[PDB]
Write a protein that binds this ligand. Sequence first.
Ligand SMILES: [Cl-]
Ligand SMILES: [Cl-]
Ligand SMILES: [Cl-]
Length: 163
Amino acid sequence: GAMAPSYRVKRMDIAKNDEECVVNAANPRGLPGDGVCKAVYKKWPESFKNSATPVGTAKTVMCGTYPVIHAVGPNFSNYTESEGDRELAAAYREVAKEVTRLGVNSVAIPLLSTGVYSGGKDRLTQSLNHLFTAMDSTDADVVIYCRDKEWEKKISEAIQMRT
Ligand SMILES: [Cl-]
Ligand SMILES: [Cl-]
Ligand SMILES: [Cl-]
């Protein structure tokens, strides 16, 4: 575990992370996809061997010795708000199980279901709060990756609020 487990936020491409493993915002079919998923496919394409997994789950595939945790959030275009919220919470719970099992001291994580799976809604707070619920009991250093300047400020504020 990390000496003093922390949360941090960075505004940059998660494919250039400085952590011991990465969480992909995957699709259920293990396809290259777009956004975070396409960046992850370009950087770790070996990790997409048998990476298909259902919504609300995470499946880890090694690229060399570097673990890629494929986490499948719900597409809110297809799910009800209620069922989508349950599957989004579940995906993060499965990420915490994998991070624990791998014994890593640090993980790079995107906000699941906040881009093309958002159903056109701002889900920063919803997604981040499910991330915290799952990861708070882990002792890995968590580094959240985002691309928008206003998102970086709001995520940083939420981290700092808990102290
Ligand atoms: Cl970048
Ligand atoms: Cl997304
Ligand atoms: Cl973003």
